[PDB]
Design an enzyme around this catalytic site. Structure first.
Site, PDB file in Angstrom:
ATOM      1  N   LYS A 255       0.816  -1.220   0.000  1.00  0.00           N
ATOM      2  CA  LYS A 255       0.000   0.000   0.000  1.00  0.00           C
ATOM      3  C   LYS A 255       0.853   1.275   0.000  1.00  0.00           C
ATOM      4  O   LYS A 255       0.400   2.328  -0.477  1.00  0.00           O
ATOM      5  CB  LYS A 255      -1.009   0.027   1.161  1.00  0.00           C
ATOM      6  CG  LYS A 255      -2.443   0.379   0.726  1.00  0.00           C
ATOM      7  CD  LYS A 255      -3.193   1.257   1.744  1.00  0.00           C
ATOM      8  CE  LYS A 255      -2.800   2.742   1.642  1.00  0.00           C
ATOM      9  NZ  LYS A 255      -3.925   3.689   1.962  1.00  0.00           N
TER      10      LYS A 255
ATOM     11  N   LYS B  39      12.992  -1.647  -2.354  1.00  0.00           N
ATOM     12  CA  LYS B  39      11.688  -1.325  -1.810  1.00  0.00           C
ATOM     13  C   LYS B  39      11.395   0.140  -2.089  1.00  0.00           C
ATOM     14  O   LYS B  39      12.189   1.029  -1.747  1.00  0.00           O
ATOM     15  CB  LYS B  39      11.631  -1.607  -0.309  1.00  0.00           C
ATOM     16  CG  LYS B  39      10.261  -2.088   0.181  1.00  0.00           C
ATOM     17  CD  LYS B  39      10.341  -2.648   1.605  1.00  0.00           C
ATOM     18  CE  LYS B  39       9.093  -3.450   2.007  1.00  0.00           C
ATOM     19  NZ  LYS B  39       9.425  -4.784   2.644  1.00  0.00           N
TER      20      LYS B  39
ATOM     21  N   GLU C   3      18.709  -6.726   0.697  1.00  0.00           N
ATOM     22  CA  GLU C   3      19.263  -7.998   0.302  1.00  0.00           C
ATOM     23  C   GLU C   3      18.187  -8.745  -0.461  1.00  0.00           C
ATOM     24  O   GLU C   3      17.010  -8.651  -0.116  1.00  0.00           O
ATOM     25  CB  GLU C   3      19.688  -8.797   1.509  1.00  0.00           C
ATOM     26  CG  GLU C   3      19.632 -10.271   1.236  1.00  0.00           C
ATOM     27  CD  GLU C   3      19.986 -11.111   2.439  1.00  0.00           C
ATOM     28  OE1 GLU C   3      20.000 -10.564   3.580  1.00  0.00           O
ATOM     29  OE2 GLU C   3      20.251 -12.320   2.221  1.00  0.00           O
ATOM     30  N   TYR C   4      18.578  -9.462  -1.514  1.00  0.00           N
ATOM     31  CA  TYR C   4      17.591 -10.209  -2.297  1.00  0.00           C
ATOM     32  C   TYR C   4      17.449 -11.660  -1.862  1.00  0.00           C
ATOM     33  O   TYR C   4      18.448 -12.365  -1.709  1.00  0.00           O
ATOM     34  CB  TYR C   4      17.925 -10.157  -3.778  1.00  0.00           C
ATOM     35  CG  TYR C   4      17.100 -11.118  -4.619  1.00  0.00           C
ATOM     36  CD1 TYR C   4      15.727 -10.927  -4.793  1.00  0.00           C
ATOM     37  CD2 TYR C   4      17.700 -12.215  -5.255  1.00  0.00           C
ATOM     38  CE1 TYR C   4      14.975 -11.797  -5.580  1.00  0.00           C
ATOM     39  CE2 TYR C   4      16.961 -13.091  -6.048  1.00  0.00           C
ATOM     40  CZ  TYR C   4      15.601 -12.880  -6.205  1.00  0.00           C
ATOM     41  OH  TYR C   4      14.868 -13.753  -6.985  1.00  0.00           O
ATOM     42  N   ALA C   5      16.207 -12.101  -1.670  1.00  0.00           N
ATOM     43  CA  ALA C   5      15.956 -13.502  -1.325  1.00  0.00           C
ATOM     44  C   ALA C   5      15.337 -14.304  -2.478  1.00  0.00           C
ATOM     45  O   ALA C   5      14.135 -14.192  -2.766  1.00  0.00           O
ATOM     46  CB  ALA C   5      15.112 -13.612  -0.073  1.00  0.00           C
TER      47      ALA C   5
ATOM     48  N   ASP D 153       7.478  -8.473  12.994  1.00  0.00           N
ATOM     49  CA  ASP D 153       6.266  -9.084  12.514  1.00  0.00           C
ATOM     50  C   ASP D 153       6.705 -10.284  11.683  1.00  0.00           C
ATOM     51  O   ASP D 153       7.149 -10.151  10.547  1.00  0.00           O
ATOM     52  CB  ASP D 153       5.513  -8.066  11.671  1.00  0.00           C
ATOM     53  CG  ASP D 153       4.282  -8.637  11.037  1.00  0.00           C
ATOM     54  OD1 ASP D 153       3.216  -8.010  11.197  1.00  0.00           O
ATOM     55  OD2 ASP D 153       4.378  -9.707  10.389  1.00  0.00           O
TER      56      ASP D 153
ATOM     57  N   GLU E  12       4.141 -14.515   5.381  1.00  0.00           N
ATOM     58  CA  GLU E  12       4.247 -13.609   4.249  1.00  0.00           C
ATOM     59  C   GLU E  12       5.318 -12.552   4.422  1.00  0.00           C
ATOM     60  O   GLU E  12       5.658 -11.880   3.474  1.00  0.00           O
ATOM     61  CB  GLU E  12       2.907 -12.924   4.015  1.00  0.00           C
ATOM     62  CG  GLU E  12       1.722 -13.753   4.485  1.00  0.00           C
ATOM     63  CD  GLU E  12       1.309 -13.418   5.908  1.00  0.00           C
ATOM     64  OE1 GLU E  12       1.227 -14.343   6.762  1.00  0.00           O
ATOM     65  OE2 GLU E  12       1.059 -12.214   6.158  1.00  0.00           O
ATOM     66  N   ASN E  13       5.815 -12.369   5.639  1.00  0.00           N
ATOM     67  CA  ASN E  13       6.970 -11.493   5.892  1.00  0.00           C
ATOM     68  C   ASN E  13       8.282 -12.234   6.015  1.00  0.00           C
ATOM     69  O   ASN E  13       9.314 -11.657   6.333  1.00  0.00           O
ATOM     70  CB  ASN E  13       6.705 -10.569   7.067  1.00  0.00           C
ATOM     71  CG  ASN E  13       5.472  -9.726   6.829  1.00  0.00           C
ATOM     72  OD1 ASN E  13       4.551  -9.701   7.650  1.00  0.00           O
ATOM     73  ND2 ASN E  13       5.419  -9.070   5.653  1.00  0.00           N
TER      74      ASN E  13
ATOM     75  N   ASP F 270      10.026  -8.197   7.332  1.00  0.00           N
ATOM     76  CA  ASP F 270       9.452  -7.283   8.306  1.00  0.00           C
ATOM     77  C   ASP F 270       9.641  -5.849   7.808  1.00  0.00           C
ATOM     78  O   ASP F 270       9.415  -5.557   6.641  1.00  0.00           O
ATOM     79  CB  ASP F 270      10.147  -7.500   9.664  1.00  0.00           C
ATOM     80  CG  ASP F 270       9.400  -6.860  10.815  1.00  0.00           C
ATOM     81  OD1 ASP F 270       8.278  -7.328  11.099  1.00  0.00           O
ATOM     82  OD2 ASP F 270       9.934  -5.900  11.426  1.00  0.00           O
TER      83      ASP F 270
HETATM   84  O1  0C6 Z   1       8.658 -14.836  -6.842  1.00  0.00           O
HETATM   85  C1  0C6 Z   1       8.325 -14.201  -5.814  1.00  0.00           C
HETATM   86  O2  0C6 Z   1       7.092 -13.994  -5.567  1.00  0.00           O
HETATM   87  C2  0C6 Z   1       9.430 -13.651  -4.938  1.00  0.00           C
HETATM   88  C3  0C6 Z   1      10.711 -14.194  -5.060  1.00  0.00           C
HETATM   89  C4  0C6 Z   1      11.765 -13.712  -4.298  1.00  0.00           C
HETATM   90  C5  0C6 Z   1      11.551 -12.663  -3.411  1.00  0.00           C
HETATM   91  N1  0C6 Z   1      12.712 -12.165  -2.594  1.00  0.00           N
HETATM   92  C6  0C6 Z   1      12.670 -10.933  -1.868  1.00  0.00           C
HETATM   93  N2  0C6 Z   1      13.846 -10.428  -1.509  1.00  0.00           N
HETATM   94  C7  0C6 Z   1      13.894  -9.259  -0.827  1.00  0.00           C
HETATM   95  C8  0C6 Z   1      12.704  -8.595  -0.499  1.00  0.00           C
HETATM   96  F1  0C6 Z   1      12.752  -7.429   0.188  1.00  0.00           F
HETATM   97  C9  0C6 Z   1      11.482  -9.176  -0.902  1.00  0.00           C
HETATM   98  N3  0C6 Z   1      10.235  -8.520  -0.577  1.00  0.00           N
HETATM   99  C10 0C6 Z   1       8.943  -9.187  -0.513  1.00  0.00           C
HETATM  100  C11 0C6 Z   1       8.204  -9.299  -1.682  1.00  0.00           C
HETATM  101  C12 0C6 Z   1       6.962  -9.910  -1.673  1.00  0.00           C
HETATM  102  C13 0C6 Z   1       6.440 -10.418  -0.489  1.00  0.00           C
HETATM  103  C14 0C6 Z   1       7.170 -10.306   0.687  1.00  0.00           C
HETATM  104  C15 0C6 Z   1       8.406  -9.688   0.680  1.00  0.00           C
HETATM  105 CL1  0C6 Z   1       9.230  -9.607   2.177  1.00  0.00          CL
HETATM  106  N4  0C6 Z   1      11.492 -10.341  -1.568  1.00  0.00           N
HETATM  107  C16 0C6 Z   1      10.265 -12.114  -3.289  1.00  0.00           C
HETATM  108  C17 0C6 Z   1       9.207 -12.599  -4.050  1.00  0.00           C
END
Ligand code: 0C6
Length: 265
Positions: free
Chosen positions: A19, A38, A87-89, A132, A136-137, A150
């Protein structure tokens, strides 16, 4: 240049949309290092009146360093937007995963849990509480790991619709919902709730009215399905206590027989 700018980055797909704004896949132009950006509108921040709030959050989250916490690399703003360099996840949200499998197992669960526990313990020591941690976080790092996102208020990948929220109270402890001041013991409530969802696939207080949910939380009414290991019940039960004081310290969790039993960690 000591200070970054949008132009220093290539932008990919949006990872989730919030949002206040979206996180995009991105890479720094030169090293071609991949990260997450972000974006926060600050129009939306003005409205909800968190600015100096946010401004001191970036301060801490930068100095935070843990394997199981998503790292804050840097930040800038332009005029109309704030930009967190995150950082990327690779693996996305534990919520997706859990939705996919519908439930986890004790080996998986216990490990996630120990991971979360070190994270918070870390946070706690740094004088940070109430992170939090709903699914989803939580994001999944390079190979297996669990990272707390978070921070920048929640964002969502395209998925269900069901809950926008609708998802809310389930991870909130009685003290918090009830509008009372809360210690570091809130985050133990949460672990309790995460754990439960991990094994069950749904949270313990889920209901179809906010009231009914709130009812079950405060009165602490939750029942396990047949399959849950008793050792699981032990920990969970020990973890969801109406009385904050009556809830374990973080190490007691890492000590717990069932933890140590099914954990990889
Ligand atoms: O394919 C997907 O839906 C996917 C794959 C990898 C992702 N990695 C990631 N890294 C750093 C972040 F700050 C982040 N933000 C985020 C995006 C969507 C939902 C929750 C979060 Cl925490 N998310 C996030 C989403």
């Amino acid at each position: 240049k000591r200070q970054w700018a949008l132009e220093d980055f290539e932008i990919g797909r949006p990872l989730g949309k919030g949002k206040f704004g979206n996180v995009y896949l991105a890479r720094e132009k030169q090293s071609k290092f991949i990260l997450a950006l972000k974006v926060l509108f600050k129009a939306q921040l003005e409205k909800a009146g968190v600015e100096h709030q946010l401004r001191r959050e970036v301060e801490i989250q930068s100095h935070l360093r843990h394997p199981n916490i998503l790292r804050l690399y840097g930040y800038f703003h332009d005029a109309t937007r704030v930009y967190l360099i995150l950082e990327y996840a690779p693996l996305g949200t534990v919520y997706r995963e859990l939705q996919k499998l519908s439930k986890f197992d004790e080996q998986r669960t216990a490990t996630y849990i120990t991971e979360l526990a070190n994270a918070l313990s870390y946070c706690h020591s740094k004088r940070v509480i109430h992170r939090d941690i709903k699914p989803e976080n939580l994001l999944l790092g390079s190979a297996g790991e669990l990272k707390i996102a978070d921070f920048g208020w929640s964002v969502h990948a395209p998925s269900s619709r069901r809950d926008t929220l609708c998802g809310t109270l389930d991870y909130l402890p009685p003290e918090m919902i009830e509008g009372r001041m809360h210690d570091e013991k809130v985050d133990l409530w949460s672990l309790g709730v995460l754990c439960y969802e991990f094994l069950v696939g749904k949270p313990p207080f889920e209901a179809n009215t906010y009231q009914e949910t709130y009812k079950r939380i405060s009165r602490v009414e939750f029942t396990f399905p047949d399959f849950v290991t008793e050792g699981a019940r032990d920990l969970i039960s020990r973890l969801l206590k109406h009385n904050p004081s009556q809830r374990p310290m973080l190490r007691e969790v890492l000590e717990h027989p069932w933890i140590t039993a099914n954990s990889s960690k």
